[PDB]
Amino acid sequence: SKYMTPMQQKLNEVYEAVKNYTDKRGRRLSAIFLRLPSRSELPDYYLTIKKPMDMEKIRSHMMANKYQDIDSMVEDFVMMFNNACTYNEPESLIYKDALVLHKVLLETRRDL
């Protein structure tokens, strides 16, 4: 087992910022984003969304050293939040959490 490369460390910092973000009430907005439900459980997502994405897929790719740069991981998160905001309506909580975590993601990015 190798120690994470310098790029994996920067990737991990972006990942953790999104994962660990809590609002003023202590709610961890990433909770619902960690693992997509199954096709059986959320069939309409799978009919609507061309490229499924969850944080577990991203974490696994990160830990495999498969991201070539920071922006490739950012793209996957952006895809995830866009999927969420396409499938769900602006009035839903998951939509608004996505917008908040999308902001958190870009802020973390700007600061690298």
Residues that bind ligand 6BL (CB under 6 A): 32-33, 36-37, 42, 45, 54, 80, 83-84, 87-88, 94
Which CB sits closer to ligand 6BL, 45 or 78? 45
| Nearest residue (CB) to ligand 6BL, 8 versus 88 | 88
Minimum CB–partner distance for residue 96 and ligand 6BL (Å): 13
Distance CA 92, CA 86 (A): 11
Measured from the CB atom, the residue of 11 and 49 that comes closer to ligand 6BL is: 49
- Name which of 22, 38, 42, 39 is nearest 30 in CA terms: 22
Among all residues, whose Cβ is closest to ligand 6BL? 84
Q: Which is nearer to ligand 6BL, 80 or 104 (CB)?
A: 80
- Copy the structure tokens of residue 18: 């999104």
Pair 71, 17: CB distance under 8 Å: no
Question: Of the candidates 106, 107, 82, 104, which has an alpha carbon nearest to the alpha carbon of residue 22?
Answer: 104
Closest CA relative to residue 87, chosen from 25, 40, 36: 36
We find the least distance from the C-beta atom of residue 14 to ligand 6BL, in angstroms, to be: 17
